Amino acid sequence: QSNMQKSLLPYYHLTKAVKLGDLKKFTSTITKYKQLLLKDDTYQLCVRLRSNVIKTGIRIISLTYKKISLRDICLKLNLDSEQTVEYMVSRAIRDGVIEAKINHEDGFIETTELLNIYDSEDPQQVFDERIKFANQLHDEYLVSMRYPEDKKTQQNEK
Amino acid sequence: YGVLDQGNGWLYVYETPNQDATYDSALELVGQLNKVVDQLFEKASVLY
Amino acid sequence: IRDEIAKNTELSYDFLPLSNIKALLFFNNEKETEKFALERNWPIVNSKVYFNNQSKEKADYEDEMMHEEDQKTNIIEKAMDYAISIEN
Amino acid sequence: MFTYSQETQHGNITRGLAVGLALINYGRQELADDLITKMLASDESLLRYGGAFTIALAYAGTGNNSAVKRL
Amino acid sequence: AAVTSSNIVLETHESGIKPYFEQKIQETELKIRSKTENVRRLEAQRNALND
Amino acid sequence: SDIYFKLKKLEKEYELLTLQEDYIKDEQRHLKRELKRAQEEVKRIQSVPLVIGQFLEPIDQNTGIVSSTTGMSYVVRILSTLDRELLKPSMSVALH
Amino acid sequence: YESAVKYALAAKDRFDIDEKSQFVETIVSKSIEMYVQEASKQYTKDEQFYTKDIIDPKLTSIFERMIEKCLKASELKLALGIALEGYRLDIIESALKSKLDQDSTSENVKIINYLLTLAITTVTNSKFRSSILRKSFDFLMN
Amino acid sequence: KMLMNLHKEQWQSGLKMYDYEEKEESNLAATKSMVKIAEQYSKRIEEEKELTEEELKTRYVGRQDPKKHLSETADETLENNIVSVLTAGVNSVAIK
Amino acid sequence: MSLQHEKVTIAPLVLLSALDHYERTQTKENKRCVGVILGDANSSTIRVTNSFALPFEEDEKNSDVWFLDHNYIENMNEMCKKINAKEKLIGWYHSGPKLRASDLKINELFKKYTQNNPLLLIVDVKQQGVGLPTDAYVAIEQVKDDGTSTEKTFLHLPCTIEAEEAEEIGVEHLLRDVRDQAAGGLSIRLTNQLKSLKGLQSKLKDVVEYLDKVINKELPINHTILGKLQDVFNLLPNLGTPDDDEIDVENHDRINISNNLQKALTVKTNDELMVIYISNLVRSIIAFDDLIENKIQNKKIQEQ
């Protein structure tokens, strides 16, 4: 839905490779398009985005299934140990990506709810942004009535 | 306005889901005023 | 690395066995695991940790300061500042 | 001048006293700020009337920002 | 240069009264444009209320 | 510099323009309160007592011709921010 | 601009080779301004107050030396112009007094007039504007 | 001071947030009514480059102008809602 | 007598007359002008229509000494029945500044002339309270709170002040202020919220203080005050309840609508801009056209 894909053909491949949680696909493309990445100053970010293959791999699976065992996620993303799962997810939730909590006495990960925020004080923050910007537009227009009038008066006859 | 529990055989029944009767009107409000701005922008900017 | 995993594991767990915290934050004694727990102000009572206890005290620290009160922005303040732009 | 302005209930005599206050305060500038606050605070029509012209005469013949805003 | 002042040496930082001239004259010319346009703005509105 | 010492006196003059600019806001407030006051008087007249006529025809669009139940016939001025579209058909009207 | 000029005089140490070189003399110019703010209020209280510790020792020494630099351009509007602004008697009395030399009859009168018309138009301060007026006539008479 | 008076109910009505049934109704009614005249605001300005102020009002039926009425409605419900959220928030925080 | 008396409305003619009388009898320095209050009574709404001075003295050494003229009241009542039919003696005013206990004794004698219970209407001549200066009272009898001593004491009747539409027009336009009896724009309604809260603040302080002085000084107990103030605590809201949660849904609803109203006014001022921008192109073309057209005119003159 971008109106060209005619140089965005490497970064379409990057969305896909992170998306499935597949490591091999990430290796094949990064070597292939190495000169292009180097030129665009996007090669440094792809050392971190190697790291986020698995971190975003988790993000589809924990979203899809509210409660899913530690062992089931070892299936899906082919992870070493149950303990290996817990470590990856714990980092991500401090960074805020998952929004979840791991329960070790019942051996499953429970993806936390967002609830209704309509009954919380969150919509009042969004409005505050909107209100402040709109007040600023009404004051600005009045100043800019005056400005064309000065420009024209100075200008040589028509 | 119900949903059916097969997890133990219950039928949860609620009346209409409560909604902002006000916010219905406010979608219509935005739809009206928005075309006014397309005209304002067209006419003020085809001067120069 | 040991200080970094304590941060992650506040949000993840509510409590843990003392043998589990031991495995996770990597330690070769239980003297190290509890020393590390009481640095992060988590009672080691019942032979379980209690991560939530440090979370309470960070929130109080913030409420005493005047940097947290206007970030919230109260509803008396929002309306009055809203009113004076119009009448200006 | 001030005391007998407040004192006389005859309206002609108050007005003459209120204007005659002004004249003494020609060229005072800064030391006429005591007078000016008293004349304007009063709820008498004549006192305020001459009260303006205390401000005219103090800074008369050169500009002044404080005097222009007050008036 | 890169170790000595050796560019924009004909004004600014030459005697202290030199940068005093420059700072202020640029401020005054910006200010008079602002004060006239605001006073005109604000009078158009007070005429509307009067109206 | 000559311009600069002449400036000092000019800057004072611009300051009185500054004080004009503060003065507008004080005039504005007075007028806005008062527009609502002016309007309050006219609401007194809109409301009771009234005497019922029957509206005939517009002769302008700000002045009309009516008849009354008083036994007379008048020319009356039509007050603003009221409908001028519903005086076309002859219908009962109220006159102050 | 303000953190810099306050820090310079707060220190009570070197920033005063920048007058003699080219670096930042915007710091110097804000120091001239700062002098107006303190002097005004203290000129009502006394006609001698320039050697108090309320007024900084750097502030005083800079103020006099700036005038010294002014007269070496050999345009006397800077010397005198600053002098009036500072709420300073000493700078004025000396400035006028040294530069009368019978360059011309017409011209010696002019030196005083620049400052004199400046006093009347610019300064609205009653105490100060009165003093100046007496001084001006003493050099004219002389 | 005597003639004017200071009311003891001036302080009670300040610190009372009116019933909430009347408030759901207030917002609901007002926002809905501005849809009917919002639409007519477009039709007014389809052209505006035409001469004469009365003329504009005669072509598209802009009599008792939809710009002036619609704005007026926007300012007056806005004044009340800001004061109402103000009073409500004052009472809850104040009293306990 | 009367068992119908809830409120006393007072016209501002009465409040001003009392004020005048104090200053035209030359009675000052906490001495008393007392006069009769005239108007209809024996109604839930008591309305005082008029007032006139009575001859009155007091000696503050012994307050069991005062002078009230017995001739004067009869003569004034006869005259006053002629002017309006409204007017009859419905109490007596006191000029304040406070309610002295000396005011019972006067009220006791005053009952004889009256056709009702007389009212003790305090009108303060120096202005007081965030509320009115004017506070009304009626003599009633009741048992104390120590369960001992039936004392005739004074029952506060609240007041709001009213005038007929006859008087009111002259009040509204003579006034030459903002008024606390009318209001303008939003700006004045911000003022009102600050003033209304300030009254609470001051009033709370009086309640705490009263509680102090009971347990310190040891003024006698009142279960009228303590009993009413018991209710206040159960009426009290608290936090953390489902009710406060319902306030927050309403606060989002009302600020959201205030956001859409604001957006609307952005398009309104965006209109005014346009009209001016159109006005600017038309004015600039015709302004210049004139100059050109004038050069040709001048040119005809020059040629011959």
Touching check for E26 and chain G: CB below 8 Å? no
The token pair that represents D15 in the structure block = 């007005």
Nearest to I224 by CA among I166, I171, I146: I146
- SS3 of chain H: helix, strand, coil, percent, to 5: 65, 0, 35
**Number of C-beta neighbours around residue C57 at 10 A:** 10
Q: Are the beta carbons of A150 and E40 separated by less than 8 Å?
A: no
**Across the beta sheet with A100-103, what order do the strands follow?**
A67-69, A108-111, A100-103
| Dist. CA H61–CA H56, nearest whole Å | 8
Give how far H55 is from chain I: nearest CA, Å: 15
Q: Looking at chain A, which runs of residues are DSSP E strands?
A: 67-69, 100-103, 108-111
* Strand partners of residue I141: I152
Under 8 Å between Cβ of I118 and I5: no
Q: What are phi and psi of I121, to 5 degrees?
A: -100, 105
Burial I163-183 (b: 16+ CB within 10 A, else e): beeeeeeebeeeeeeeeebeb
| Dist. CA A129–CA H8, nearest whole Å | 39
Q: Which amino acid is at I128?
A: Q
* Strand partners of residue I154: I139
For residue I93, give the H/E element and its range.
Answer: strand I88-94
- Please report where in the chains the tokens 């009067």 appear, as a residue: E50
| Dist. CA E38–CA I189, nearest whole Å | 28
| Dist. CA G58–CA G31, nearest whole Å | 9
Under 8 Å between Cβ of A10 and A34: no
Chains with at least 3 CB pairs less than 8 angstroms from chain G: D, E, F
Measure CB to CB from residue F9 to each of G81, G114, G122 and give the nearest one: G122
Under 8 Å between Cβ of I106 and I66: yes
| Dist. CA I23–CA I19, nearest whole Å | 7
The token pair that represents E1 in the structure block = 């240069």
Q: Give first-to-last CA distance, chain I, whole Å.
A: 109
Residue B17 per-residue DSSP state: P
Q: How many residues does chain H have?
A: 96
* Strand partners of residue B10: B5
Residues from chain G that touch F8, judged by Cβ atoms under 8 A, are 118, 122
Q: How far is CA H7 from the centre of its chain?
A: 27
**Number of C-beta neighbours around residue C35 at 10 A:** 12
Nearest to C16 by CA among C47, C40, C53, C38: C47
Q: What are phi and psi of I276, to 5 degrees?
A: -65, -40
Under 8 Å between Cβ of I247 and H92: yes
- Resolution limit, Å: 4.5
Please return the burial class of F60, using the count of CB atoms within 10 Å of its CB with bins 0-12, 13-18 and 19+. exposed
Give how far A4 is from chain C: nearest CA, Å: 41
Q: How far is CA I186 from the centre of its chain?
A: 21
DSSP-assigned letters across all residues of I54-72: E-EEE-SS-SS-EEE-SSH
**Number of C-beta neighbours around residue F47 at 10 A:** 8
Touching check for B19 and chain H: CB below 8 Å? no
Distance (Å) of CA A103 to CA A114, A136, C56, G2: 18, 49, 21, 57
Q: What are phi and psi of I47, to 5 degrees?
A: -125, 130
Residues from chain H that touch F79, judged by Cβ atoms under 8 A, are none
Q: Which of H31, H47, H60 to mutate to test the interface with B (most CBs of B within 10 A)?
A: H31
Report the structure determination method. Answer: cryo-EM
- Please report where in the chains the tokens 């209409």 appear, as a residue: B16
Under 8 Å between Cβ of I119 and I156: no
Angle at I58 (CA atoms; ends I54, I63), nearest 5 degrees:
130
Please return the burial class of C34, using the count of CB atoms within 10 Å of its CB with bins 0-12, 13-18 and 19+. middle
Under 8 Å between Cβ of I46 and I9: yes
| Dist. CA E40–CA E37, nearest whole Å | 5
Residues from chain E that touch G23, judged by Cβ atoms under 8 A, are 5, 13
For residue B2, give the H/E element and its range.
Answer: strand B2-5
Q: Is G9 left (phi over 0), alpha (psi -120 to 50) or beta?
A: alpha
Under 8 Å between Cβ of D6 and D29: no
**Number of C-beta neighbours around residue I252 at 10 A:** 20
Q: What are phi and psi of F77, to 5 degrees?
A: -100, 135
Give how far D27 is from chain G: nearest CA, Å: 10
The token pair that represents G2 in the structure block = 């303000």
Distance (Å) of CA G55 to CA A61, G9, I16, I266: 72, 11, 60, 53
Angle at A45 (CA atoms; ends A40, A50), nearest 5 degrees:
125
Residues from chain H that touch I126, judged by Cβ atoms under 8 A, are none
| Dist. CA C6–CA C41, nearest whole Å | 11
| Dist. CA G108–CA G140, nearest whole Å | 9
Helix orientation angle between G77-85 and F2-46, rounded to the nearest 10 degrees: 40
Strands I88-94 and B2-5: unpaired
Helix orientation angle between A122-154 and I242-303, rounded to the nearest 10 degrees: 10
The token pair that represents I164 in the structure block = 């007929």
Nearest to I276 by CA among B47, E42, B39, F21: B47
Distance (Å) of CA E17 to CA G9, G67, G90, I165, I202: 18, 10, 20, 73, 58
Q: Which of C76, C82, C86 to mutate to test the interface with H (most CBs of H within 10 A)?
A: C76
Under 8 Å between Cβ of H27 and I253: yes
Nearest to I40 by CA among I5, I75, I3, I79: I5
Distance (Å) of CA I141 to CA I2, I130, I150, I153: 13, 30, 7, 6
The token pair that represents G125 in the structure block = 């301060």
| Dist. CA I140–CA H3, nearest whole Å | 31
| Dist. CA I10–CA I49, nearest whole Å | 7
Chain breaks in chain F (C to N over 2.5 A) after: none
The token pair that represents A13 in the structure block = 């491949």
Rg, C-alpha atoms of chain C: 20
Helix orientation angle between G26-45 and G57-71, rounded to the nearest 10 degrees: 110
Touching check for C88 and chain H: CB below 8 Å? no
Nearest to I222 by CA among I119, I120, I151: I151
Q: Which of H53, H60, H64, H72 to mutate to test the interface with F (most CBs of F within 10 A)?
A: H64
